[PDB]
Amino acid sequence: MVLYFIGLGLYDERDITVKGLEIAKKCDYVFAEFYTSLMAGTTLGRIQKLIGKEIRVLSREDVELNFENIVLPLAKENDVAFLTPGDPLVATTHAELRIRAKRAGVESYVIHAPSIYSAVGITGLHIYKFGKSATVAYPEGNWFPTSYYDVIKENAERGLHTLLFLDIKAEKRMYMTANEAMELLLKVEDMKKGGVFTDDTLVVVLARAGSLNPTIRAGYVKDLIREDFGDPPHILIVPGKLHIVEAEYLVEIAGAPREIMRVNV
Amino acid sequence: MVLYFIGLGLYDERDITVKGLEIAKKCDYVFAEFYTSLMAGTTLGRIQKLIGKEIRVLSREDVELNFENIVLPLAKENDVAFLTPGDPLVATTHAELRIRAKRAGVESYVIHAPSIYSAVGITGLHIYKFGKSATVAYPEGNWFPTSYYDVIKENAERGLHTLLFLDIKAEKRMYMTANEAMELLLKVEDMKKGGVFTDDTLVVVLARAGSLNPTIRAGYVKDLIREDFGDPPHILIVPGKLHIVEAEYLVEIAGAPREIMRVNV
Numbered sequence: 001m002v003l004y005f006i007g008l009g010l011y012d013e014r015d016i017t018v019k020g021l022e023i024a025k026k027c028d029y030v031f032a033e034f035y036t037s038l039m040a041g042t043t044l045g046r047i048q049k050l051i052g053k054e055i056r057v058l059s060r061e062d063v064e065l066n067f068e069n070i071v072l073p074l075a076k077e078n079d080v081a082f083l084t085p086g087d088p089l090v091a092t093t094h095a096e097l098r099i100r101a102k103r104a105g106v107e108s109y110v111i112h113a114p115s116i117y118s119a120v121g122i123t124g125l126h127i128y129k130f131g132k133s134a135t136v137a138y139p140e141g142n143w144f145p146t147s148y149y150d151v152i153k154e155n156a157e158r159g160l161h162t163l164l165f166l167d168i169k170a171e172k173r174m175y176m177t178a179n180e181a182m183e184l185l186l187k188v189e190d191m192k193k194g195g196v197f198t199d200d201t202l203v204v205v206l207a208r209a210g211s212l213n214p215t216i217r218a219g220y221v222k223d224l225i226r227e228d229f230g231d232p233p234h235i236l237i238v239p240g241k242l243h244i245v246e247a248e249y250l251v252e253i254a255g256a257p258r259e260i261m262r263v264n265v
Numbered sequence: 266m267v268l269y270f271i272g273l274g275l276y277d278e279r280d281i282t283v284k285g286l287e288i289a290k291k292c293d294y295v296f297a298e299f300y301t302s303l304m305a306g307t308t309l310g311r312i313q314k315l316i317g318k319e320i321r322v323l324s325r326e327d328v329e330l331n332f333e334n335i336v337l338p339l340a341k342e343n344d345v346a347f348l349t350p351g352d353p354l355v356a357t358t359h360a361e362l363r364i365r366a367k368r369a370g371v372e373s374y375v376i377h378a379p380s381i382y383s384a385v386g387i388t389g390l391h392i393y394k395f396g397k398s399a400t401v402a403y404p405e406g407n408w409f410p411t412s413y414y415d416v417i418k419e420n421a422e423r424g425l426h427t428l429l430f431l432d433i434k435a436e437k438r439m440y441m442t443a444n445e446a447m448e449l450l451l452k453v454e455d456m457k458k459g460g461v462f463t464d465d466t467l468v469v470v471l472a473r474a475g476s477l478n479p480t481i482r483a484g485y486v487k488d489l490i491r492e493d494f495g496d497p498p499h500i501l502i503v504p505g506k507l508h509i510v511e512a513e514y515l516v517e518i519a520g521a522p523r524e525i526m527r528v529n530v
């Protein structure tokens with residue numbers, strides 16, 4: 001009679017919380033989705049071994065189209081867990097699943113875990129200064145989405161930082177790199193010419209948040225556009241005007257050039 | 266000879282990640298601070314029992330003035346951990362402590378935990394739509410803080426959600442409620458006359474996120490201002506323009522007035 005939405009956290013199988021792990025272990029059935037994002041530092045097998053339960057993976061169609069036929073039925077007579085990378089309900093589509101549960105007569109609870117949305121605190125940038133967030137999507141065919149460029153522009157002119165989630169083709173396990181993201185933004189800039197993203201723009205790259213050894217690098221696009229930030233996943237941030245304390249952390253911890261202390265503060 | 270910043274999470278001792286617990290258990294010395302937030306579902310004793318180590322609790326003065334004299338000296342010959350509620354680098358000034366660690370020649374690592382900043386996803390409001398954040402601070406003497414009001418205005422004008430962290434006085438044992446926050450905002454409104462926060466404003470309250478049964482309520486200020494949301498900590502949110510799916514969730518899960526679903530596009 002209970003469905004548990006449990007977050008797996010940022011990177012590997014140990015990023016789930018003690019609460020989530022223990023609840024997952026006592027569940028009769030465990031489902032999981034790996035389409036909103038992936039857990040790059042581990043494998044389904046390693047997660048299954050930690051939880052000590054078989055994990056049935058569900059595709060985007062399984063959930064969006066058949067959540068009430070695959071998950072809820074069992075939840076009606078058993079304790080069921082639904083695992084998701086990161087923190088449940090950060091991904092926009094998760095929320096409505098709780099409504100489906102309610103209508104099915106199923107009780108649901110949320111077990112939180114770290115999300116990249118909050119983990120960016122490790123960049124040294126103040127969390128309150130982050131504005132609207134956006135996702136950089138790979139252009140396809142004649143489709144060239146550019147709304148993320150506008151998000152940066154609007155946040156930046158208000159002195160706010162912009163968190164850019166990078167595209168991920170979940171099925172193919174293909175991650176957009178921060179390099180690809182910078183190349184795309186420079187291309188959008190050349191088209192809109194809004195003076196929003198250029199070779200002189202300061203950016204921050206966070207790779208493998210959650211890992212003990214994430215890559216945290218800050219610098220100008222001209223210098224970072226071809227730098228190796230390591231294995232995925234990558235997150236790109238275009239900060240707004242910096243507080244001196246943010247700048248000092250970027251220089252000391254993220255290898256930023258001293259120049260940011262006079263150009264971006 | 267390392268220093269670990271480890272988050273304990275939102276509500277109880279089980280909100281720590283397995284990774285954080287594993288590492289904490291093996292450290293030689295374990296320190297912690299409990300003034301940046303409130304974990305309403307546990308106690309020092311339960312946390313100590315979980316990690317199997319004595320926890321040296323530090324005050325704001327101990328940390329801000331003497332972190333390098335109390336914690337770092339030990340980190341040079343031992344594995345040391347510094348615990349904090351939620352995520353150690355969200356809505357705190359602890360990031361600067363990593364610079365202090367560097368200066369002392371001490372390598373530091375960060376272990377994330379569930380944060381209220383991302384936990385707000387449980388309100389059903391799309392995370393990417395949250396704009397700049399702010400803190401509603403208790404007025405003191407003849408000083409009456411009002412910066413948070415201007416944040417709401419700026420975000421609302423862009424159709425963005427505003428997360429309002431509520432003040433805390435750990436040593437005084439004072440935890441600002443959503444009610445008190447609303448009372449304060451109404452007073453700022455009467456003063457600035459911006460039409461930003463009134464009795465007809467729709468707001469959302471999230472209390473004790475992390476618990477299995479947090480209090481999630483949405484409605485107009487006039488109806489919620491004197492409602493009992495339970496024990497602290499509390500967080501207040503002033504939504505921007507709602508998507509229909511957000512409204513649906515607030516109505517079905519947070520008990521908001523069914524009328525909000527009739528959005529005015």
Ligand SMILES: Nc1ncnc2c1ncn2[C@@H]1O[C@H](CSCC[C@H](N)C(=O)O)[C@@H](O)[C@H]1O
Binds near residue numbers: 433
């Ligand atoms: N479980 C919880 N429920 C509701 N609000 C919470 C909360 N935990 C923290 N807050 C809110 O955030 C304030 C502390 S700000 C420090 C936040 C912490 N680093 C984190 O990552 O969560 C509190 O005064 C309260 O307004």
